[PDB]
Amino acid sequence: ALLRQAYSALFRRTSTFALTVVLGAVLFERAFDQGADAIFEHLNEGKLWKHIKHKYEAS
Amino acid sequence: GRLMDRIRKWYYNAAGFNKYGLMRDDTLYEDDDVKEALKRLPKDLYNERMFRIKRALDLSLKHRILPKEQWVKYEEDKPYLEPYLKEVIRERLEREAWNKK
Amino acid sequence: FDYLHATAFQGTALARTVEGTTENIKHLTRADLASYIDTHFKAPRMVLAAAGGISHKELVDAARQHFSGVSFTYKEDAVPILPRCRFTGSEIRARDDALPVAHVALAVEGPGWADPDNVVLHVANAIIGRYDRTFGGGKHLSSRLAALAVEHKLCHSFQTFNTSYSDTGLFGFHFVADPLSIDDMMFCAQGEWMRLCTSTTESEVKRAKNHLRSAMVAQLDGTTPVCETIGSHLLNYGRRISLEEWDSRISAVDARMVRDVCSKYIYDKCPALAAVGPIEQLLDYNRIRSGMYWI
Amino acid sequence: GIHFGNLARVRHIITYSLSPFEQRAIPNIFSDALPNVWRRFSSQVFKVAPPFLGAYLLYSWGTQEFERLKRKNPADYEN
Amino acid sequence: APNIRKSHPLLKMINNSLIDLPAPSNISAWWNFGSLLAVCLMTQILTGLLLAMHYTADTSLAFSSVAHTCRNVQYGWLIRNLHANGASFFFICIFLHIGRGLYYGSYLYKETWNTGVILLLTLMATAFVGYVLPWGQMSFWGATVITNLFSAIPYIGHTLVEWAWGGFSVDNPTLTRFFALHFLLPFAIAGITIIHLTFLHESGSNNPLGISSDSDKIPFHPYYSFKDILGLTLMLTPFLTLALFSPNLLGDPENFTPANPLVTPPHIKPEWYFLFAYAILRSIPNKLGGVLALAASVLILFLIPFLHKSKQRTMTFRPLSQTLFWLLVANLLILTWIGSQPVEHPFIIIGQMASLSYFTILLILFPTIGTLENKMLNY
Ligand code: HEM
Ligand code: HEM
Ligand SMILES: CC(/C=C/[C@@]1(C)[C@H](C)CCC(=O)[C@@H]1C)=C\Cc1c(O)c(Cl)c(C)c(C=O)c1O
Ligand SMILES: CC(/C=C/[C@@]1(C)[C@H](C)CCC(=O)[C@@H]1C)=C\Cc1c(O)c(Cl)c(C)c(C=O)c1O
């Protein structure tokens, strides 16, 4: 049971609760960022310089 | 005549303070006279008026009203404070007049 | 305390007063009392206890002679098991600003006679102890809460309590105070509970133990008391628990133990509250709730 | 400073409440909630909406009427 | 002693004005504007400084500094936005904060109210001069007209205009003393805000039903602290959806054209939150009258507490006042439209009406229907 495993190990102790928010905010960020950028770039295929780019680059 | 005497009953249902269980007098805004009046209310009449109000507020925090059945009815509304208040304002006008005099 | 049960175990059997309702007493019939005696006052569920200058033998004989009921089926020799009572974290506020002082009781669900932890819990209750307006000790009392109580005039009296039942219980405290100091008292009180779960020392427990040991002996100060112990030991703990034993269990306790146990039944739990009197200054369950964590 | 204890004199009122951990956050969404959302909407939509719908017209009118005065009336150059 | 929350000369304040504060248990969402208004102030002030650190109060450099602030300053563009749009959401919020007060007779708390009116005037003045700093077309002509208002005073008038400009026609001195002025005012706001809230505390908050809530108060925290955090994330969503997706929606574009002392744009309208007054100004076809009407268009707020006749506090139980109240809202909603239209028929006539309408619903109707209602209750 995660809710109990979590409560007992993470949410109970007001000190571990913090560690969770930090540790979590870190993971949440790194993922929410890729995802959104991934969503956005996809919604604008071939319009961004990330796409055009290869045409005047080097190889 | 019996004109604004039926209008009154209309307005009374229009206001809707009865939907909360408040007598017309439970809604009076507490200025100086009203405050004095309320201090003259007999123990029980005061404790009842209190519950009515503390209950209406609890309703308002919940965003509800009383089931239609419990609503006060235009003719069963006791003007429990009206007479006291009348006197308070009466005693006052005396003083006021007596002091300019 | 009734209102406390009344809401702590709300919706169950324990939530009832011993005296019963007004309607019941006004209508209970000869039949019911009869049927009550018939259904409940039965040999397997009774215990003839006695203490003093008496022959165990001569006692058992007199028993065989007048305490003679017979058992045929298995039903008669069966001791029913009661349907469990559900603990509810809630509150009941009975206000009357016309009463001289206010009364407040707070508790969490207890383990129940069986559990060995009840020992630790009682040691715990010793550390906090109790106090009241006439204690000579005053500002020097070893009970941190009693001191503060004295220092700031927090109350007229307060007391810890570990009421136990077959399968459940109530572990808490009760204080009486003036309308204008309920808040601080309640504040200091929860405060002392949290200290229990987090920073109890070896000095506090040592004394706690000695205080319990003495209360445990004063429990048996007379024949009536010793008989009451024996009557309630068989009926609840199963057999009889000797002082030599109790004492061994009480010695086994220490800091780590108290903390681990109080944390077990007190930390972050939703308590039950009962307030009676001019209780305006004490307020919000939400607040009292938050007093259940972080010392 | 502190107003908790002075406020007012109250007698004979009992209140029962339950911890938040024992109850539901948003209970009876259908049987209770929405019904009242509607209850309220109804009672009020006729004191509110009217004057708004009213100004609306005055808006659309004055708007279209200012546009009409831009257009030309043939009866000026049919000479 | 005992707790360090009630004794400490400071924490006893954070605690005694926002944590142990006695709050009515039934205040509705119309009570969440106090905090949003507060939050704006801090947000405005913060984003403001950030900008002041790249602005340059000088005619020959104001426009290009703001432009540079955006195109070059890292996230400058975002900060510029937030600051400009915060000005709007600040007004939106202050307007609802006012209505609420009007509809629920909070103005019966006279000092708390009068300080409020003062706040409004100050916020207006502030938002005005801020709008002048980028030195755009509106910036200039705005500065010109508003400072010109004093010219309506007999004798001095013109004299007063000389200071305001620092010369004999808007120019650099005006721009720098405006930047100084803008930089300063926000703090006076924050200052008075503190008084506003102090007078409040003497009495306590009002509530929808308008009857003493002493029988049922609750600790601001966690009830209203959580309710306000939420009320924040809601205002914040459209504020950001607006500022991030449609930046210039709410703003006039004339300010994208560097001021020209010789050309008054033909479509010269003020920031949206001032239109309604701009509308009244153009109603009265007389210099001094239009000015007086304008002044009174806001100053009339000081009279409200004195034009209360109902024997009840709020309009919750006054269906006639309600209608009149909502008829008043739509009344303003119109003036705003009028202000955004040219001075031509049918507008001119519709205008003078809504204005005449505005002053009547407040000075004559409300106090009248109020008296009437009293009799219908048999009082
Ligand atoms: C800088 C501007 C302002 C800020 C930051 C501000 C803030 C506050 C705050 C935080 C509250 C408490 C919570 C609430 O009831 O909303 C409050 C209450 C109040 N404010 Fe303001 N206010 C401002 C302007 C005004 C204005 C313009 C008026 C008057 C036209 C006003 C009238 C009131 C009144 C009457 C109260 C009591 C509300 C009640 O009855 O509950 N305020 N204000
Ligand atoms: C009362 C809160 C505030 C309000 C109402 C406010 C409002 C405004 C307004 C309307 C503008 C014009 C925005 C635009 O470009 O369209 C502005 C700009 C500006 N404000 Fe404020 N302001 C506030 C606080 C501050 C403070 C205290 C500072 C700095 C410490 C500041 C610095 C500036 C600067 C530098 C500009 C001009 C450049 C720009 O527009 O980005 N503001 N402000
Ligand atoms: C400005 C504010 C709260 C601000 C914050 C900043 C807290 C200090 C901490 C958590 C938050 O995020 C709130 C928004 C509250 C204003 C405020 C008041 O001043 C007063 Cl007298 C009352 C009675 C209320 C009632 O709701 C209120 O909201
Ligand atoms: C709305 C208004 C003035 C409002 C003030 C002057 C109040 C009367 C008092 C408090 C203030 O500080 C406001 C800025 C004036 C009308 C007004 C404007 O706002 C603006 Cl931006 C412009 C460009 C013009 C041009 O003609 C105008 O007539």
mmCIF file with all atom_site columns, N, CA, C and O in Angstrom, chain E residues 305-329:
data_model
loop_
_atom_site.group_PDB
_atom_site.id
_atom_site.type_symbol
_atom_site.label_atom_id
_atom_site.label_alt_id
_atom_site.label_comp_id
_atom_site.label_asym_id
_atom_site.label_entity_id
_atom_site.label_seq_id
_atom_site.pdbx_PDB_ins_code
_atom_site.Cartn_x
_atom_site.Cartn_y
_atom_site.Cartn_z
_atom_site.occupancy
_atom_site.B_iso_or_equiv
_atom_site.pdbx_formal_charge
_atom_site.auth_seq_id
_atom_site.auth_comp_id
_atom_site.auth_asym_id
_atom_site.auth_atom_id
_atom_site.pdbx_PDB_model_num
ATOM 1   N N  . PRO E 1 305 ? -20.966 56.627 2.528   1.00 0.00 ? 305 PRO E N  1
ATOM 2   C CA . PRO E 1 305 ? -21.325 56.322 3.920   1.00 0.00 ? 305 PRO E CA 1
ATOM 3   C C  . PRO E 1 305 ? -22.460 57.192 4.439   1.00 0.00 ? 305 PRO E C  1
ATOM 4   O O  . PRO E 1 305 ? -23.260 56.751 5.255   1.00 0.00 ? 305 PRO E O  1
ATOM 5   N N  . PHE E 1 306 ? -22.526 58.431 3.960   1.00 0.00 ? 306 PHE E N  1
ATOM 6   C CA . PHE E 1 306 ? -23.550 59.380 4.399   1.00 0.00 ? 306 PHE E CA 1
ATOM 7   C C  . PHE E 1 306 ? -24.916 59.275 3.693   1.00 0.00 ? 306 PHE E C  1
ATOM 8   O O  . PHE E 1 306 ? -25.907 59.851 4.148   1.00 0.00 ? 306 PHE E O  1
ATOM 9   N N  . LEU E 1 307 ? -24.961 58.538 2.584   1.00 0.00 ? 307 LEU E N  1
ATOM 10  C CA . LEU E 1 307 ? -26.199 58.346 1.823   1.00 0.00 ? 307 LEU E CA 1
ATOM 11  C C  . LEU E 1 307 ? -26.732 56.931 2.018   1.00 0.00 ? 307 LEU E C  1
ATOM 12  O O  . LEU E 1 307 ? -27.190 56.280 1.083   1.00 0.00 ? 307 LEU E O  1
ATOM 13  N N  . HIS E 1 308 ? -26.653 56.454 3.247   1.00 0.00 ? 308 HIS E N  1
ATOM 14  C CA . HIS E 1 308 ? -27.132 55.126 3.566   1.00 0.00 ? 308 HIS E CA 1
ATOM 15  C C  . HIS E 1 308 ? -28.378 55.342 4.391   1.00 0.00 ? 308 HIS E C  1
ATOM 16  O O  . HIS E 1 308 ? -28.326 56.002 5.433   1.00 0.00 ? 308 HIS E O  1
ATOM 17  N N  . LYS E 1 309 ? -29.497 54.793 3.932   1.00 0.00 ? 309 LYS E N  1
ATOM 18  C CA . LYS E 1 309 ? -30.748 54.968 4.651   1.00 0.00 ? 309 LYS E CA 1
ATOM 19  C C  . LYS E 1 309 ? -31.336 53.660 5.145   1.00 0.00 ? 309 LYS E C  1
ATOM 20  O O  . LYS E 1 309 ? -32.056 53.633 6.143   1.00 0.00 ? 309 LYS E O  1
ATOM 21  N N  . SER E 1 310 ? -31.028 52.571 4.453   1.00 0.00 ? 310 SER E N  1
ATOM 22  C CA . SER E 1 310 ? -31.573 51.281 4.847   1.00 0.00 ? 310 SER E CA 1
ATOM 23  C C  . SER E 1 310 ? -31.344 51.012 6.328   1.00 0.00 ? 310 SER E C  1
ATOM 24  O O  . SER E 1 310 ? -30.383 51.502 6.911   1.00 0.00 ? 310 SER E O  1
ATOM 25  N N  . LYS E 1 311 ? -32.236 50.250 6.949   1.00 0.00 ? 311 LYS E N  1
ATOM 26  C CA . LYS E 1 311 ? -32.066 49.934 8.361   1.00 0.00 ? 311 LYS E CA 1
ATOM 27  C C  . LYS E 1 311 ? -31.294 48.634 8.484   1.00 0.00 ? 311 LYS E C  1
ATOM 28  O O  . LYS E 1 311 ? -30.989 48.169 9.587   1.00 0.00 ? 311 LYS E O  1
ATOM 29  N N  . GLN E 1 312 ? -30.981 48.057 7.329   1.00 0.00 ? 312 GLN E N  1
ATOM 30  C CA . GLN E 1 312 ? -30.210 46.823 7.249   1.00 0.00 ? 312 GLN E CA 1
ATOM 31  C C  . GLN E 1 312 ? -28.857 47.230 6.676   1.00 0.00 ? 312 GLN E C  1
ATOM 32  O O  . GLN E 1 312 ? -28.747 48.282 6.042   1.00 0.00 ? 312 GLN E O  1
ATOM 33  N N  . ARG E 1 313 ? -27.825 46.420 6.890   1.00 0.00 ? 313 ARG E N  1
ATOM 34  C CA . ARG E 1 313 ? -26.514 46.798 6.385   1.00 0.00 ? 313 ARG E CA 1
ATOM 35  C C  . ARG E 1 313 ? -26.260 46.511 4.911   1.00 0.00 ? 313 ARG E C  1
ATOM 36  O O  . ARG E 1 313 ? -25.881 47.406 4.150   1.00 0.00 ? 313 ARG E O  1
ATOM 37  N N  . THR E 1 314 ? -26.457 45.256 4.517   1.00 0.00 ? 314 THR E N  1
ATOM 38  C CA . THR E 1 314 ? -26.222 44.844 3.138   1.00 0.00 ? 314 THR E CA 1
ATOM 39  C C  . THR E 1 314 ? -27.460 44.819 2.265   1.00 0.00 ? 314 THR E C  1
ATOM 40  O O  . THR E 1 314 ? -28.580 45.053 2.718   1.00 0.00 ? 314 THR E O  1
ATOM 41  N N  . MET E 1 315 ? -27.228 44.505 0.995   1.00 0.00 ? 315 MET E N  1
ATOM 42  C CA . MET E 1 315 ? -28.280 44.409 0.002   1.00 0.00 ? 315 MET E CA 1
ATOM 43  C C  . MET E 1 315 ? -28.663 42.951 -0.198  1.00 0.00 ? 315 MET E C  1
ATOM 44  O O  . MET E 1 315 ? -29.350 42.614 -1.154  1.00 0.00 ? 315 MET E O  1
ATOM 45  N N  . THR E 1 316 ? -28.219 42.072 0.688   1.00 0.00 ? 316 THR E N  1
ATOM 46  C CA . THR E 1 316 ? -28.571 40.675 0.517   1.00 0.00 ? 316 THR E CA 1
ATOM 47  C C  . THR E 1 316 ? -30.081 40.514 0.606   1.00 0.00 ? 316 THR E C  1
ATOM 48  O O  . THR E 1 316 ? -30.668 39.737 -0.142  1.00 0.00 ? 316 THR E O  1
ATOM 49  N N  . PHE E 1 317 ? -30.701 41.274 1.507   1.00 0.00 ? 317 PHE E N  1
ATOM 50  C CA . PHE E 1 317 ? -32.144 41.210 1.718   1.00 0.00 ? 317 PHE E CA 1
ATOM 51  C C  . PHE E 1 317 ? -32.892 42.460 1.240   1.00 0.00 ? 317 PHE E C  1
ATOM 52  O O  . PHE E 1 317 ? -33.917 42.844 1.810   1.00 0.00 ? 317 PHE E O  1
ATOM 53  N N  . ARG E 1 318 ? -32.369 43.094 0.198   1.00 0.00 ? 318 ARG E N  1
ATOM 54  C CA . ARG E 1 318 ? -32.979 44.288 -0.393  1.00 0.00 ? 318 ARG E CA 1
ATOM 55  C C  . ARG E 1 318 ? -32.953 44.117 -1.918  1.00 0.00 ? 318 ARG E C  1
ATOM 56  O O  . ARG E 1 318 ? -32.041 44.606 -2.594  1.00 0.00 ? 318 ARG E O  1
ATOM 57  N N  . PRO E 1 319 ? -33.966 43.431 -2.479  1.00 0.00 ? 319 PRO E N  1
ATOM 58  C CA . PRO E 1 319 ? -34.091 43.167 -3.918  1.00 0.00 ? 319 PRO E CA 1
ATOM 59  C C  . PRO E 1 319 ? -34.173 44.406 -4.803  1.00 0.00 ? 319 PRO E C  1
ATOM 60  O O  . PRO E 1 319 ? -33.791 44.355 -5.974  1.00 0.00 ? 319 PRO E O  1
ATOM 61  N N  . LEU E 1 320 ? -34.684 45.509 -4.255  1.00 0.00 ? 320 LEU E N  1
ATOM 62  C CA . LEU E 1 320 ? -34.777 46.763 -5.011  1.00 0.00 ? 320 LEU E CA 1
ATOM 63  C C  . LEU E 1 320 ? -33.392 47.423 -5.113  1.00 0.00 ? 320 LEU E C  1
ATOM 64  O O  . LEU E 1 320 ? -32.985 47.876 -6.191  1.00 0.00 ? 320 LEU E O  1
ATOM 65  N N  . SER E 1 321 ? -32.674 47.490 -3.991  1.00 0.00 ? 321 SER E N  1
ATOM 66  C CA . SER E 1 321 ? -31.340 48.062 -4.002  1.00 0.00 ? 321 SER E CA 1
ATOM 67  C C  . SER E 1 321 ? -30.499 47.225 -4.956  1.00 0.00 ? 321 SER E C  1
ATOM 68  O O  . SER E 1 321 ? -29.762 47.769 -5.768  1.00 0.00 ? 321 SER E O  1
ATOM 69  N N  . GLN E 1 322 ? -30.623 45.905 -4.869  1.00 0.00 ? 322 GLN E N  1
ATOM 70  C CA . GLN E 1 322 ? -29.876 45.007 -5.748  1.00 0.00 ? 322 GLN E CA 1
ATOM 71  C C  . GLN E 1 322 ? -29.974 45.429 -7.204  1.00 0.00 ? 322 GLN E C  1
ATOM 72  O O  . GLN E 1 322 ? -28.966 45.675 -7.869  1.00 0.00 ? 322 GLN E O  1
ATOM 73  N N  . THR E 1 323 ? -31.203 45.479 -7.702  1.00 0.00 ? 323 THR E N  1
ATOM 74  C CA . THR E 1 323 ? -31.453 45.875 -9.077  1.00 0.00 ? 323 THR E CA 1
ATOM 75  C C  . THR E 1 323 ? -30.801 47.217 -9.377  1.00 0.00 ? 323 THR E C  1
ATOM 76  O O  . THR E 1 323 ? -30.087 47.364 -10.368 1.00 0.00 ? 323 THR E O  1
ATOM 77  N N  . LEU E 1 324 ? -31.039 48.191 -8.509  1.00 0.00 ? 324 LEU E N  1
ATOM 78  C CA . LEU E 1 324 ? -30.450 49.499 -8.695  1.00 0.00 ? 324 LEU E CA 1
ATOM 79  C C  . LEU E 1 324 ? -28.914 49.380 -8.728  1.00 0.00 ? 324 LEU E C  1
ATOM 80  O O  . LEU E 1 324 ? -28.256 50.017 -9.556  1.00 0.00 ? 324 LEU E O  1
ATOM 81  N N  . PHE E 1 325 ? -28.353 48.552 -7.843  1.00 0.00 ? 325 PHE E N  1
ATOM 82  C CA . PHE E 1 325 ? -26.903 48.330 -7.764  1.00 0.00 ? 325 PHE E CA 1
ATOM 83  C C  . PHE E 1 325 ? -26.359 47.791 -9.084  1.00 0.00 ? 325 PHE E C  1
ATOM 84  O O  . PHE E 1 325 ? -25.382 48.322 -9.621  1.00 0.00 ? 325 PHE E O  1
ATOM 85  N N  . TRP E 1 326 ? -26.991 46.732 -9.592  1.00 0.00 ? 326 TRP E N  1
ATOM 86  C CA . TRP E 1 326 ? -26.582 46.107 -10.844 1.00 0.00 ? 326 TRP E CA 1
ATOM 87  C C  . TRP E 1 326 ? -26.865 46.965 -12.050 1.00 0.00 ? 326 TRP E C  1
ATOM 88  O O  . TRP E 1 326 ? -26.261 46.790 -13.105 1.00 0.00 ? 326 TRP E O  1
ATOM 89  N N  . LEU E 1 327 ? -27.802 47.883 -11.896 1.00 0.00 ? 327 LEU E N  1
ATOM 90  C CA . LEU E 1 327 ? -28.137 48.785 -12.973 1.00 0.00 ? 327 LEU E CA 1
ATOM 91  C C  . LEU E 1 327 ? -27.024 49.806 -13.037 1.00 0.00 ? 327 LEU E C  1
ATOM 92  O O  . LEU E 1 327 ? -26.734 50.360 -14.095 1.00 0.00 ? 327 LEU E O  1
ATOM 93  N N  . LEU E 1 328 ? -26.418 50.053 -11.875 1.00 0.00 ? 328 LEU E N  1
ATOM 94  C CA . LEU E 1 328 ? -25.309 50.995 -11.743 1.00 0.00 ? 328 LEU E CA 1
ATOM 95  C C  . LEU E 1 328 ? -24.045 50.417 -12.369 1.00 0.00 ? 328 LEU E C  1
ATOM 96  O O  . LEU E 1 328 ? -23.286 51.128 -13.036 1.00 0.00 ? 328 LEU E O  1
ATOM 97  N N  . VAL E 1 329 ? -23.811 49.129 -12.137 1.00 0.00 ? 329 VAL E N  1
ATOM 98  C CA . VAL E 1 329 ? -22.643 48.476 -12.700 1.00 0.00 ? 329 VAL E CA 1
ATOM 99  C C  . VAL E 1 329 ? -22.707 48.605 -14.212 1.00 0.00 ? 329 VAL E C  1
ATOM 100 O O  . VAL E 1 329 ? -21.790 49.136 -14.832 1.00 0.00 ? 329 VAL E O  1
#
